[PDB]
Design a protein around this ligand. Sequence first.
Ligand SMILES: NC(=S)c1ccc2c(c1)OCO2
Ligand SMILES: [Mn+2]
Ligand SMILES: [Mn+2]
Lengths: 137, 137
Amino acid sequence: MLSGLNHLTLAVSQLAPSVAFYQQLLGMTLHARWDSGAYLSCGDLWLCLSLDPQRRVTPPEESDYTHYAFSISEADFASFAARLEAAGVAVWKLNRSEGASHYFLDPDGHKLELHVGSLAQRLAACREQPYKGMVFF
Amino acid sequence: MLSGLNHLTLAVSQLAPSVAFYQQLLGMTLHARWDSGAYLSCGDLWLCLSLDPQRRVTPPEESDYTHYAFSISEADFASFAARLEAAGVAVWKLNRSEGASHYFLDPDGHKLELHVGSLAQRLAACREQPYKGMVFF
Ligand SMILES: NC(=S)c1ccc2c(c1)OCO2
Ligand SMILES: [Mn+2]
Ligand SMILES: [Mn+2]
C-alpha cells in the first residue's frame, strides 16, 4: 500500500541557481548538496534537485499543465507573492478557482504554485458547485 | 513560509486510463472525477489528474529526470513492484542509486517511483556511501 509522497525530484540545468531559488528565495531547508544534486525539505516534503544536462529551460507555452503546489497560509500569501514579484519571478497563469493561488515558474520553467486550501476544502466547494460531469465517491 | 506540498497535478492525455492506473493499479483513493479531471489521495498527498490536450505520451529517453516517488513499507515493497512488473508496467531505471526503489512509468510516461525510506534515512545512508562531492548541512 502506498502511504504518501516520498519525494519530488526536479531535473535542473544549473545547480547553483536552483539551490538559490529553492533555499534562499523560497525558504526551504538545504540538508545536503553534491556535485550533481541537492536535498531540501519544505515541511514534510522531501525535494531533490538533480543536475541533468537533458533539462531544457522550457517556456510555459511549451510544457503541459503538470505542476507542483506548495502550501502557505492565507495570512502569509500576499507577502510571499510580493517577494516573488520583487525577485522578477514569472507568472504562468492567473487564479480563477477557489482558494488563493499564485502560479510561478522556477529557473528551468518548472510550473509551481502557492495555494491556500486543502483537498477537503476543494471537495466541499465542488459539492456545492460541481464541475461539468462531476461525480463523487 | 512554505509548509509542504499542497498538491501534485499531473497532465494526462486520456482521463479514464489514468484514473484507472492511479486508483485500480496503484491503490490510491478516488474522491471525485469530472469531464476534465480527477482528485485522488495517497495518504496525505492530494493528487490531481488534469486532462490536457497538450500532454504527450513521452518515452523515458525523451524526458528529463524529473520524477515522483511514493512511499511504501519495506514489507510491501517487493510484492508491489513485482505486481507492477507482471502487469506489464513500463520501466525507466534499474540502478538503485538512491536506495530501495522501483522506477516505473504511468500511461503518459510520467516518471514514478516506489521508495522505501525517509529523507533522514537517506542522509544517514549517504554519510556511509556519499554521492561524489557530498556535503551535509
Ligand atoms: N466509471 C466512472 S466513475 C466514469 C466512467 C466514465 C465517465 C465518467 C465516470 O464520467 C465521464 O465519463
Ligand atoms: Mn494547482
Ligand atoms: Mn527518486
